Amino acid sequence: GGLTDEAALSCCSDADPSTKDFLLQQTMLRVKDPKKSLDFYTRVLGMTLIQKCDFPIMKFSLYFLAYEDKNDIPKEKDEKIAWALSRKATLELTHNWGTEDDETQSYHNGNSDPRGFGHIGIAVPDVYSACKRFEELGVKFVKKPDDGKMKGLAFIQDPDGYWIEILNPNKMATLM
Amino acid sequence: GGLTDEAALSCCSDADPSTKDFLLQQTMLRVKDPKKSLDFYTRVLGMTLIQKCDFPIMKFSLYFLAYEDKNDIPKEKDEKIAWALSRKATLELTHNWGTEDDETQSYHNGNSDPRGFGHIGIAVPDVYSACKRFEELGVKFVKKPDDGKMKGLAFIQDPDGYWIEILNPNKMATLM
Numbered sequence: 362g363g364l365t366d367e368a369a370l371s372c373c374s375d376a377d378p379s380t381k382d383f384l385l386q387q388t389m390l391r392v393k394d395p396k397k398s399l400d401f402y403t404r405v406l407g408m409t410l411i412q413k414c415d416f417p418i419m420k421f422s423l424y425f426l427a428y429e430d431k432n433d434i435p436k437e438k439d440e441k442i443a444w445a446l447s448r449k450a451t452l453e454l455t456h457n458w459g460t461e462d463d464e465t466q467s468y469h470n471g472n473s474d475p476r477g478f479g480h481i482g483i484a485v486p487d488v489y490s491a492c493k494r495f496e497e498l499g500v501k502f503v504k505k506p507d508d509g510k511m512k513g514l515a516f517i518q519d520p521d522g523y524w525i526e527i528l529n530p531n532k533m534a535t536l537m
Numbered sequence: 538g539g540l541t542d543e544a545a546l547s548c549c550s551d552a553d554p555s556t557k558d559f560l561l562q563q564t565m566l567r568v569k570d571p572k573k574s575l576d577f578y579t580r581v582l583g584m585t586l587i588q589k590c591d592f593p594i595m596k597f598s599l600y601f602l603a604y605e606d607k608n609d610i611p612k613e614k615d616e617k618i619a620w621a622l623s624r625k626a627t628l629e630l631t632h633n634w635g636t637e638d639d640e641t642q643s644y645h646n647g648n649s650d651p652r653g654f655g656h657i658g659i660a661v662p663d664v665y666s667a668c669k670r671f672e673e674l675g676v677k678f679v680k681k682p683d684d685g686k687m688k689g690l691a692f693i694q695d696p697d698g699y700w701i702e703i704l705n706p707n708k709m710a711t712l713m
């Protein structure tokens with residue numbers, strides 16, 4: 362039947378001082394086509410592209426997206442890397458060059474066998490209004506807010522089929 | 538050859554005002570054994586468990602971990618959920634009840650066919666000190682800091698085999 366509150370807490374330790382400045386900096390997802398991914402995460406979800414890195418020998422690129430004001434992006438190349446890679450809660454999209462012109466290639470979202478990774482989640486002030494806009498923009502849904510058991514919570518899909526939860530922290534609780 | 542900087546930025550739209558309060562709140566990973574996972578994320582990496590949710594009908598639990606001072610966590614149940622779910626850069630661990638008793642079961646880390654999700658990444662002040670401690674603790678490495686060509690960057694594995702990048706934002710002005 363899963364862990365009790367007490368038993369779970371007993372598996373938690375205090376934060377060692379060696380970790381006192383650590384931060385959760387990135388989640389990395391592989392994307393078939395950066396052109397579509399960048400459009401979606403910026404235009405649909407309102408993120409900013411804060412940093413792009415290219416690796417000519419290994420034939421890939423990295424794109425870092427985050428909810429930052431673009432005015433806060435350092436102007437100078439090396440400070441920009443340091444500022445971008447020290448932001449909390451970035452999404453790192455990896456583009457293996459060539460995948461966008463490979464009809465036999467696609468990435469797996471982790472929600473069908475074999476499962477692992479499930480989703481990223483965006484907290485929003487208003488799930489319904491967010492998702493009305495998503496519908497208007499042609500976004501694909503796994504779960505509309507009012508579908509299924511858990512009313513008020515939605516899951517959309519990015520261009521690769523990655524699941525993105527859309528949740529309002531303040532309506533969570535006052536539910537089921 | 539992937540996108541040029543200029544071409545990539547061309548694909549980026551400014552944020553619609555409706556998204557201006559959005560934030561990247563969680564990354565969800567399924568975990569075979571929440572006891573081991575809680576031990577790893579708290580004692581090894583120095584995260585804090587900020588909320589736990591049990592769903593006896595669906596036979597699963599959720600554990601939200603973050604780099605948050607436990608002394609900031611609200612005492613009242615509703616206020617705690619609203620606070621936890623509004624924190625940036627959380628890790629959501631999903632425990633499907635009974636996986637820890639099933640020798641035939643394991644989750645997939647996204648780093649082999651079928652690929653998708655790659656890793657989460659922790660920004661640390663010093664990759665070499667951090668990794669020295671991980672080694673004293675018997676952490677399983679995927680890439681030690683000096684192995685391979687990307688010197689000064691590391692990968693470890695959590696108890697499910699998910700990869701976790703260890704990066705130093707202030708040295709990383711040498712890579713790209």
Ligand SMILES: COc1c(/C=C/C(=O)c2ccc(O)cc2)ccc(O)c1O
Nearest residue numbers: 482511526532533534535536537565629
């Ligand atoms: C797949 O399950 C989830 C759920 C699922 C949780 C619920 O359905 C729920 C019901 C009442 C309430 O007051 C809060 C939540 C909630 C958040 C989340 O991030 C996640 O991954």
Ligand SMILES: COc1c(/C=C/C(=O)c2ccc(O)cc2)ccc(O)c1O
Nearest residue numbers: 389423453455658679680685687702704
């Ligand atoms: C994709 O994540 C990155 C990468 C990318 C690095 C890798 O993908 C990698 C994977 C396995 C291995 O053994 C060595 C390297 C490089 C720099 C960076 O800052 C970052 O976040």
Ligand SMILES: [Zn+2]
Nearest residue numbers: 389453658702
């Ligand atoms: Zn990375």
Ligand SMILES: [Zn+2]
Nearest residue numbers: 482526565629
């Ligand atoms: Zn979630």
